[PDB]
Structures are given as structure tokens and as C-alpha cells.
Ligand binder design. Sequence first.
Ligand SMILES: Cc1ncc(C[n+]2csc(CCOP(=O)(O)OP(=O)(O)O)c2C)c(N)n1
Ligand SMILES: Cc1ncc(C[n+]2csc(CCOP(=O)(O)OP(=O)(O)O)c2C)c(N)n1
Ligand SMILES: Cc1ncc(C[n+]2csc(CCOP(=O)(O)OP(=O)(O)O)c2C)c(N)n1
Ligand SMILES: [Ca+2]
Ligand SMILES: [Ca+2]
Ligand SMILES: [Ca+2]
Ligand SMILES: [Mg+2]
Lengths: 524, 525, 524
Amino acid sequence: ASVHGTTYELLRRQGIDTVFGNPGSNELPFLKDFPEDFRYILALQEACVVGIADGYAQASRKPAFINLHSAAGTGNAMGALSNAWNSHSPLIVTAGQQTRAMIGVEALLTNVDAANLPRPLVKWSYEPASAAEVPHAMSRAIHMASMAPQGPVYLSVPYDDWDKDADPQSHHLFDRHVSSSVRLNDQDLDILVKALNSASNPAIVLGPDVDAANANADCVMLAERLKAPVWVAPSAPRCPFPTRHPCFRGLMPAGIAAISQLLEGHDVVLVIGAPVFRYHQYDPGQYLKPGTRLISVTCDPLEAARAPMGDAIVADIGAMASALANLVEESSRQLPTAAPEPAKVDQDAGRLHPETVFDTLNDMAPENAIYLNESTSTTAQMWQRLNMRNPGSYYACAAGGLGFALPAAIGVQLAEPERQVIAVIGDGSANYSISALWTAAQYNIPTIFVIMNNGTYGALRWFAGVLEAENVPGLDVPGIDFRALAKGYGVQALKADNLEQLKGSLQEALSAKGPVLIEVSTVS
Amino acid sequence: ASVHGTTYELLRRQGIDTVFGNPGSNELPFLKDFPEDFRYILALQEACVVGIADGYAQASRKPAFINLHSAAGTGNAMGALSNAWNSHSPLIVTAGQQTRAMIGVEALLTNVDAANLPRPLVKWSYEPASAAEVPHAMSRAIHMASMAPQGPVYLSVPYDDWDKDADPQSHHLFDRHVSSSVRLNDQDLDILVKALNSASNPAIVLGPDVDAANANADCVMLAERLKAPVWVAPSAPRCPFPTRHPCFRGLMPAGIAAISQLLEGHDVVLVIGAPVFRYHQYDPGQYLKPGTRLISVTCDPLEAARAPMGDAIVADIGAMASALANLVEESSRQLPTAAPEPAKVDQDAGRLHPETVFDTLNDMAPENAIYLNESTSTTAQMWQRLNMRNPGSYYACAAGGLGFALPAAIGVQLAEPERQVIAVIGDGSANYSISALWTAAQYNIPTIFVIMNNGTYGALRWFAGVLEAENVPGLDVPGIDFRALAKGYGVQALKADNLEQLKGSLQEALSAKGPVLIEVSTVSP
Amino acid sequence: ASVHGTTYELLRRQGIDTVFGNPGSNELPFLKDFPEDFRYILALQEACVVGIADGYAQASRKPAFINLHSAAGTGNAMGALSNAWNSHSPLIVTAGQQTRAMIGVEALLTNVDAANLPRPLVKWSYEPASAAEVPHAMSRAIHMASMAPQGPVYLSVPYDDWDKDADPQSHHLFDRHVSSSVRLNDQDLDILVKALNSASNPAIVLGPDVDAANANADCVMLAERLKAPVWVAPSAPRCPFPTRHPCFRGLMPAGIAAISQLLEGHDVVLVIGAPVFRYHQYDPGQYLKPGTRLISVTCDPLEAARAPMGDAIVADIGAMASALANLVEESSRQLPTAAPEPAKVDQDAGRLHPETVFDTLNDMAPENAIYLNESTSTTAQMWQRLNMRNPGSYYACAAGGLGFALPAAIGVQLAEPERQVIAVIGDGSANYSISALWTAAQYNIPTIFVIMNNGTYGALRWFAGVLEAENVPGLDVPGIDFRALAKGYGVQALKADNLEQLKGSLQEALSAKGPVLIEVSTVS
Ligand SMILES: Cc1ncc(C[n+]2csc(CCOP(=O)(O)OP(=O)(O)O)c2C)c(N)n1
Ligand SMILES: Cc1ncc(C[n+]2csc(CCOP(=O)(O)OP(=O)(O)O)c2C)c(N)n1
Ligand SMILES: Cc1ncc(C[n+]2csc(CCOP(=O)(O)OP(=O)(O)O)c2C)c(N)n1
Ligand SMILES: [Ca+2]
Ligand SMILES: [Ca+2]
Ligand SMILES: [Ca+2]
Ligand SMILES: [Mg+2]
């Protein structure tokens, strides 16, 4: 059989049946005779390709397969790869290389030093030394992406390899099962469980790997047993806990001092599936107060090594959450009281306050809606105001790289055609991957895009205000017509200048047949 | 003085007065107190930032300075950087890093292993070990970008460094003059000149570094003296020669066999300012036919090393072109035989043949117009049908990475406000960096964008055919309304469905005072 | 406190008390005021420094701390690092950098692009962005080296950092405990155990990570329960099983076809703590023969991904071995019968056959002796003739890089003062790290070095025969006097041109209280 045929067999055997791509000549010999059982999702720029794939992978909890064009295409996607690294997204990124005979002379489209291009943003990066090695290399990519801690990988393939003969011993690859579903040994796990049982005032902090593992329900049981308040770790890329459950306490501020203060008085803090911690703002202070001990369960050795405090256990989040939830004692302590619902903010007939927008989404959106956040200046409000009962309900750019949410929302909606996806996106952020709108239109993926238009890079303006930095250029983005941009790519567009228009647009969008963009006039 | 003050002084003293950027929090400490003698050019996505800066650098023939946001911003620009590497564009790329106190924990926005991120697409990548070193690092970046062979460099700076004290000895950096304007020693140069004078049937091949060096006029004189046919090297990022001058033979096809055939019978082939060669399609054959020797003059040791044939000389293209032009003897040989005229393809009343588009542009555009090309299936015809007689009249993505021409056209037009820029871009290519349109509107940069809309990735459909490849997905791009995209970003838009609308649209565009986009309905392949 | 004092405090708190180094001016600010609770072990060249630390780490089963001089010193050690990578040795490699103020001008002894220098042979490689970060970076280094899969790490430190003020919050690093002692979840472990219980003809293959984990005894119990033959995986850097135990079947040949033939008719092959597989010679064929299924337990995701056949589980070897050993049922099958004793080779009164050397060693050496192998051409014979009953009894260069055995034997002897270390090295290999001898002399480390002098690169000469390769230069190394070399570095030296002198030299050597080298005239 050919490398071509063997590789598609390996993919399908390993559960992959979709290719997210933007095509090129180095990739045609891979894409020719495209298997009918495979689906190809085209996007018009590679940041969009990767972002869609990323949303798909994250929501589906399985690897996604990407096909890019040489160095230029790979390059266009490297911002998106920065997010994917930080979210542990299992992405198999393949790029076409020139024919081996023309690599030496560096003909046009030659990916020079190809494996180094995507570093340091990939778990594994590789170009095979012969055509017959390609299926084995593809097998390595699949598993490296899929093993804890999950993340993106890179495979570069000379386009003349595909038509060559595959090693018949490659059949050994098709059905390999590789597991990293592991948990702490019995002896040490017992020691951990006793420490949890003995805590007089425990707290739990959850990160994105909990939602990726679908460990949310186990985490709920664990919290209910320990009678423990539950926080989301800072700079949250996903939502790992029902936000109206009694133990929930919200999103932790991304600051060193703020967090040690929040945790003051808690004798044991159990962190699951988070870096410790993804701080952001300068907020110097104590990592922890005396009296607080921290214990981290992470799937990522890199996270365990760099935590500035606490003990760490490196293991699968699914396996560990389930074990803990089922082993700890039911504490007789009082179950935490649910946090008070957010207070309504006075809204005039002027421009919308973000608080108003989120309140209104909460009232109108389905219970199983999925939200995406690319409105940096309104994240705190969004966390306080949306009731997210179910797993897989929130995605935001894990590395802070703009250009994630608009394409990722399309990927998520493809992964979950039964759950209404709603992407809330700043006017500044909307532009980075604006062409992804075309894929929603073309593939009939009915994502709803809510553009928060305040004419500025608002978070930046605020920060500038905090540093008392004057004469900063480039903070204002006037003069974009988002309804026209939507029409450009074939997506239905609506506008909302006040709350009542917001209500009507959301009503129309929820019921519309295709994707819908709503441009919302908000206050800076 | 602060690192901030010292850095800005270094920059102005080294001739930089423009920052192309898309700002972020790590860069705020650098952008604050923005000096009145600098201008900032904002663009909405980093591929656009770098593309605009790239066009500006190439047309102005001077380094351009860029400021991006950490890893994500840098990442978003790495396609553009791929082109800049191949074009030898002198781009100084700076990106903000987390405050040093928070790098260890890898706080959000931390550029991990920052210097490795843009490798291998940069001549130099670095993060300084202390705040006081920033100015020195910046100086290294300026000179690494500017020395032959020019190209992009990268510097990562922790945002807390800017307010720190700068080494007082930094002042020695301000007026540093570094030169690589060098040519072959007299002895060996004379041997080269003798070889040219002795050749019975010399041929000249010119690459983009000729136009970068503004050596075009010197190459014209060289070609005339030797009465030599002049090619442009394949996959041309620039135009190094007047395309209707009698020596001009055309753009070489990017094929090994094709090129060796074109050079058949030429005893000495002189290549100047090109890789040998930037082939593309698979065209197996001889690199050179027997009886033909090749001598390459390149500014780039990497090009000299990888050439599969020929002698090479690594030197400044400007200095070598000038010396050779003035040293070689005047041959009494006959000039090359006149090239035929391109056919006027019959045009019905419907969608436009690209040949029609190019013939019309060439009839209506000013003699000093500057074209950009990201209409990939139409390149051959474009080169056959446009008379480009002046230096700096053509730019195309040097690494074949789409998303170059649209922003680059804005930067070129910014660099040359007296010459009308006309960017010819396929409907597929138009999307990669569509948001650059906003920069043209906001700063009122009057670039003309001609979108060739055939509804497909035409060059890919063609290659799929040649390869006889069936059931290739993803080659069609229906359903994009470029007039609405234009409106979206505040750019005037026109539509041209036939020849008469094309003429009328171009006439209005050429008169217009701001940027203008024309969507042209072209024939489908 | 200073970065210096805070860093030594971290070191001691994390169990480190020994520094293996070859000093330089960038390192003097670190080495000054050397704590009284630490010892420094000097060697004269950096490949020796690392080899010795490597032997020490592997034997002690704990990380080893190393301090080298900038780029040149690091560079001299990079062959030693190749071996340490392949053996998963937990080595913390520190190197001094120029003072921060001079790095930009690239003063002499600046380590340029320092973190890239030891790539790709280290798990983590880093230069801190500030002095106050050094302790934290050291903590990262300690934990990245020590987490499964263990391996070498690199940390570069500008020499001016040590006298600067530390971060007061560094104290949170001192007592961090980081575990990767994990095993497969109960449900999937039960499935694995069932497969093993149900197999009709199992086989077990053990690699070096078994010996690293001190899982040998659990593996013995597992083999005994399952009544299964036990191989050692090819290219063995350690001995994971008692070699005269009845299940033991020896070292597998390092070939694809040789291995599938060995495993033919074994329905389930369980591999533990080995790559799958470290083949060497070209020996094309089937990875497995039909009817064999393979299950790999590895501590290393990179091993699991690259196996061309079988299933894998990525987990701690110690935890998994112990679990399986205690869960599997006692098979009714008959316990495998021990391998026949090695036949005595005809030995005349001249130069020694290697077979004769090993029998003599085996007959004279103490039961708890530890051997090291750097005699490539006699590896097979060695495994068959040395009775090794105990764990930690064998070390050979895991990446095949010469220069390991001599210094590593010194490290091992330092780690195991009550066990006699005997290094068997070829006259060719002896030279690569000859100066390590001095360290043994200076610290009175009583290793025994047996040099097998045949005046040629025997393995190469042989290979050349199988390649039918004529006119290969550089295969012969005549004219080396190893006794004078030993004397050169202060080590007592003996000779053995025949069996009789071999016996007497060995008796002397074993009695010796200091190091002893024995030059032995072997055939070929
Ligand atoms: C790819 C990328 N480029 C630049 C930045 C820097 N940055 C972070 S937030 C921000 C402003 C976002 O604007 P908008 O989407 O309007 O959100 P708002 O602040 O207005 O709520 C910018 C420019 C980034 N994080 N990622
Ligand atoms: C960033 C990037 N992505 C993908 C490609 C592969 N590619 C090269 S030409 C081409 C088609 C371009 O189509 P269009 O711009 O419409 O011009 P046409 O081919 O129709 O003349 C594609 C997809 C590329 N060169 N660069
Ligand atoms: C650092 C290094 N250099 C070169 C080699 C290649 N090599 C492997 S074995 C060998 C010869 C070893 O001979 P000797 O140590 O005398 O033992 P013999 O082969 O004679 O049994 C060589 C050169 C290597 N493995 N490592
Ligand atoms: Ca905004
Ligand atoms: Ca097209
Ligand atoms: Ca030998
Ligand atoms: Mg890189």
C-alpha cells in the first residue's frame, strides 16, 4: 500500500475523520483522492484553521487534525499555536514540505529547518528521514498530542512521500492503544485523602484540565464531601464547575497577593488541573500566608516543576478526581452557602454596560449554551453573570492571544451541533481572525457572534491608566462596520444600540437558521 | 537616563522615525511618552503590521521598526516573517515580554524561550539579560537587520526594563556607522571583467537584491555594454530591470530543466542579486547545459553555498553592479532579437480574462506606477503585459506566503506617496490579511486594490490537473463580497463585471484621493 | 539572604549534599563559602565529572548535582549527556555564565545562547532573567530532573547573581514534594491483569527503568507468578533481573527479526521499563510475528509514542511493577527451567579469551559485586558468564557513547562503599575518559578497573567484516601502556598476560583498599 493509503487508514483507525486545512501545492499529494469517510473543513487563513481545530478538539475531548502549507502557512498559525499550548489542546499539525529532491537547493515553498519553526509551542516537532517512515511518524504525532499533558505537535512531510510504498509492518500502528490514565499509588493516595479528611477549613481550586478531562461532576462530589468552597484558577481558559453550585466562589484574581489573601485561613488548598498559578498583573506579595498548605494535582510536569509553592502530584486529572471524590469522607461541616446573585446595574437608554449584556444572555440563552470570551475588559463581569451548569460551557484564549474565540466558536459549534454557541468578542479582537466567519457560512455552522463595540482596545486603555502612562498611541479602533464585514463573508448581521434592541437581536439570532453576527454598542 | 529615553535616542540617531505596531500590555511601558518626532502606524493583526512594515522597508530601502505583543503577537506574524527572510527585508521586530519578576512562574503573556520562537526565520533573535543592556541589544538588532544580507531580526524586552537606568556608556551606540558596501578585490575583479569581455555569448540573470540596492540602472548599462539578454530570476519578489528594454527576455520559469534550456548556448552566464535559483515546480533535468559556465554575485553567503553550480562572489550588489557596469568593454555584437508582443486575447462581454485586465492596466496606469502581485495563477501574463520601466515597480511574496501584498501595498504607498500603488490580488489571497484595509482608510493611504475574483484557488486547481489529482478538497472560495469587506473597513469600493466597468472603475480609482478597492469578476479556470 | 545561601538551603532541603565539578571563574562566586554539609568531588575533565555524577545518580537512585564552566565545560560533557539522556539519569547540570553586564559584548567565557547548547540531550534547559529568580529556577531544575521520566537538566547562572538578594518568598521552595509515583487506574489495571491471567504463553521483557526503580524484586515475583520467561531488552544499560534465576533467558539481540523470532508463539509479551525496542544492527523483518500481542509499561511518553507495535501504558515503573506483581494469579504452568551453565572455552597458556576473563571474575568476585561494561565486543559473553543476583549490579553506556564506564564506576563505588565495583573496559574505550582515574586516587575510591587489551577496536573490525568493507582506516590502537597511564594518575597497576597472572592480579586487587587497574592481554 502507499504511504498515502496507510496514513489515512492509521488516522481513521485512531478515531480521526476530519481535516482542518488551508491547502497548498506541497499538500495536494496528501489531499488527492481524499477518502469519502473524511471531512475537510476549509478556512481562509491559518490562524483561523488552527483556531477552529482548537475549539473542535477542546469541546470534543479528542485530537484534531490540521493540514497547513509549508513554513508560511505554519507561520500564519503560530499565534493560534501559542493558545493551544497553554490550553493543552491535542492538535496534530501537519505541513507540506517540498519534494525531497528540491529541498537542498531551497526551492520556493521549502520549509527550512522545519522542525524548529513551531518551537517552543509544540510537544514534539519532526520531519521523517524517508517516505516509508511517514506513517510511523504520524503515529508518534497522534500519541504525543493525545498523551497527558495533551498539546500540539508538528509533522512536516515532503510531498513526494505520499505516493511511495509504505512498510507493510506499518499495520502494527493501526490499533495501538496508549494510555496515560494514571493516578497516585495507593499508599500515597491514602496519605493525601487523610490530609483532606483532617483539614479543618479546606479549599479547592480548579483549572481547565478538569473540564478537558470531564472531571467536573467528580469535582462537584469532592467539594460536596469536603464542604469546601471552590474557586476557578486565574486566567481561566475553560469552566470546570457549575457556576451556581453552592460551593462556587468564582474566578480568582490573577495576582500573587490577591490569591494568598483569598486563601488566608484555609489550612489545606487542593489545586486540580491548573498551573500554580497563571498570574497576570503585577501584584507582588506572599505566594501563600502562613497557615495555608497547598497541594497540586496536575497532568503536566512542567506545571509541577514551576509552581513556586506547595506539594505536587503529576497524574491524569480524570483518574485522580474520580479517586479522590470517591475516597474522601463526608464531612459533617456545613455545606457552603451559594454566593449572592449579581446585582442589577442601572441601565439607561444609552450604550450597553457589559453587565447588562451578560445578564441578558443569561436570561435568554439555553441552559446548555456554550460561551466563548474574547472581551478582555469584561471577563470578571461575565464570570459573575452567566449560569453555566454543564461541562464544556466556556472557552477563552489560554495564552491571551487574540484571534482565538471567533474561529474556536465555529469549531466548538461543529463539535456540538446540539448546543448553541455564543461568542462574546471585543471590537478589537474581532479583527484578528475575521475571515473565519466564512467557514461558518459555508459549512452552515450556526454560531452566534456578539461583538462588543466600544471603539477601543479597552483593557489596554485601562492598564495605561493604571500605570499613569500618557501619550500611548494605537489604543483606538474607530471606523469598523461589523455588519458589513459579516455580509462580506455571507453571515447574517444585526445591530443593537440599546437594551431593547439587544433583546430583539438575541431573540432573532437564537431562532435564525444560520450563523449570526450582532454588533452591540457598548460603553468604553 | 532611562532605557526608554536612551532607546528612542538610539533609534532617531540611527534614522528610524516610524513604528509599525499592534500594541499590548507588555509594550505599554515602551509606547508611553511616545516622542513627537516619531509616528506610529497601527494595524489590526500582526501579519498586517509586519506586511505593511515590509512593503515600507523594501520601497524606502531602509530598515523598518516593528513592535508586537509577546508570543501571540509574534506568532501571528511568522508567516509574514517567512516572506521577509526570503526578500532580505531589514525589519527590526521587537516584542514585549512579562516583567522579569514574573517570567519564572510563566505568568500569562510570558514569552517562553522567546528567542527560539521566530527561528529559523530571523538573522538574529535575542532577549537581554538585564535592563541596562537593552539599548545595546537594540543597537545589535538595528545593525544585524541592516548589514548585508539584510533581513529580519527579533528582540524580546521585559516590560519592566524600560523605566530602568540605562548604562551611561550607551551614548557610544548612538552614532555607530556599520558598512558592508564591499566589492571584489581589484585583482580578482579584473579576472571577472576579462571573462565578461571574452565571452562570445554572455547572458545576465537578475534577482531582487538588484532592485533592493537600486542597481537597476547599472545593470541596464552592463547589459547594454555586453549586448546581453537579461532574464529575471524565477519566483521574483521584485523587478530588477525595465521590462520593455531591448535586452529584457522575461521572467524565468521556476524549473531546473526550463532554465538550463533558456541558457543553452550562452558561454558565460552572470547572475546578480539572486539565489541560484528559486525553482518551484518539479522540472527535473540539467542545472546547466554543457558549454555554459555560471558566475553568481550575491550578498548572501547562504545563497552562494547552496547554489548547485557556478562560481560565486559574496559582496554588495550596489557596489559590484556599479563597478562591473563601468569596467566592462563595449561589445559590438548585435542586441538580442526583439521579443514578440503578447497576444490580445478575445474578450467576450462577460467575465474578464486576466490578460484583459493586465492590458487595460498597462494602457491606463501612469508610467511610474508600482504593482504588487498576489494573483498566483496570472503571474506569467502579468510579467508579459506590464511595462515597468522604473526601479521599485514590483513586489510579490518572496516565500510564496499569501497575505503579503495587501498590507505591503499600503506600506509601499506610504513610502512612495508620489507613485500610485496598484495591488493585484486574487480573491483567495485577499483574505489572509484583509484587515490591513483599515490601516489604509485610517491613515488615508491611497493604494488601489484590484481583486481578481474567479471564485477559486486557481493555481491550485491547475496544479491538481497537471498532477491528475482527483477529489482534492478545499479549492473553491465562493461567497465573498469584497465591496462589503471594503466598506467594513472604511475603504471605497467599486465592482467591475465587464471590460467597460473595468475601464470606468480604474478611471475613478486613479482620480480618487483615498484608498480604493475594485472587485473584478475574472474568468474561472 | 543571598541567592547563594538560599540556593544551598534549597539544595540541602531537597536532599543534595554532593557537588561533582570541574571549577572555573564563572563558578567561583557559587563555590565560595562552600557549606560544611556538602562535599565536592573534583574531576579533571568534564566528561569525567558527568560520568562520575551519572554513576552516582544511577546507583543511588537519587539526583546528582553537577557544576561546570560555561560553554566549553558544558561542551566537553555533551557526549556524557547523550548517555545520561538514554539512561534517564537524574542529573542537575549547572554551568556558570559571565556577569550580566558583560554578556552583551560577548566577553570571554560568555555562554552564548546558553539554553540551546545542551539541546536536545536535556529535559529542560534554562537561564534565569534575574538574580532573584535563581533559587526558583534551581527548584525547577531539581524537580524536572527527578520526575518520571527522569533525565538530565541544564541551568546557566550569571556569576554576579549569587551575591544578590534572594526573593524572601523563596522559602516556599525548600520543602516542596513532587510525586510522579503513579499507576494505571483500577478499572484499566483490572483489564490488564485479566489479560495477563488469561495468557497461555506469556513472556516478560525488562529494561533499565526497572533497575532504576528497584522494581527487580517485584518483577521476579511477577515472573514467578506468571511462570514466564524473562528477557532483558536489547542494548541494556542496566541489569533488571537476577541472571541465574530460572526464568531468566538473557539479553535480547538488538535486531528486529531476531526479536520477533524470539517472541514467536508467545501470545502476550509484557515489556516493562524499556524502549520498544533499542535495536542496533540492521536486521529487517517483522516487528512481531502473527499471534503475538505486546503491552508496554514505560515511564516515558517518548518511548510510548515511538513504539512501532503494541499497546502502552505510561506510568511509574516501581508503582506498576509492584501492583502487577501483587494482583496477578499464581499460574498452574510449570516454572521455566534455568538456562544451562556456560561451556568452558579452550584456553591455552598465552593470551586470554574474554570467556576466560569472565569465568575467573565470576568465580572470584563477591556476590554483591557491581560490574560496568565498556567492552563492546564481549558484551554477549559477559551477560552469560557473570552471575548477578542483586539489583544495581550492571551499568553500560546507554547511548553507546564511549567514556562512560571508567568515570561512572568511580561514581557507583562512591555511592556503594560496601559493594566492590569492577569495570571491564576495552583498551580502545579506556582512553576516552582516562583522567577520571585521578578522582579515584584522590578520594581513595577503591574501584577495580580491568582493561581488556586486544590492541584494536574489535567491534568495529568485526562489523567491517559483515559489511565486506575493505580498506577502513583507524581501527587499530597499538602502543598503549595502561599501567603507565594508571601510574600517571596515582592508581596502583597490575598486569595479566596469562590465566595464572590474571588470578593473582585479581586476588591482589580485591584485597586492595585503594583503586587498582589491571591490564589484561586478550585475544581477538
Ligand atoms: C494577538 C494579540 N495581539 C495583541 C494583544 C494585546 N491586547 C490584549 S487585550 C487587547 C485589547 C482587546 O480589545 P477588545 O477586543 O476591544 O477588548 P476590550 O479591551 O475592548 O474589552 C490587546 C490589543 C493580544 N493579547 N493578542
Ligand atoms: C499563507 C498561504 N496559505 C496557503 C498557500 C497555498 N496557496 C498558494 S497559491 C494559492 C491559491 C491562491 O488563489 P488566489 O489568490 O485566488 O489566486 P489564483 O490562484 O486564483 O490566481 C494557495 C492556497 C500559500 N501560498 N500561502
Ligand atoms: C564516543 C564514541 N566514539 C566512537 C564510538 C564508536 N565505537 C563503538 S565501539 C568502538 C571500539 C571499542 O573498542 P574497545 O573499547 O577496545 O573494545 P572492543 O571493541 O575491542 O571489544 C568505537 C570506536 C562510540 N561508541 N563512542
Ligand atoms: Ca473594545
Ligand atoms: Ca482565485
Ligand atoms: Ca579493543
Ligand atoms: Mg521557532
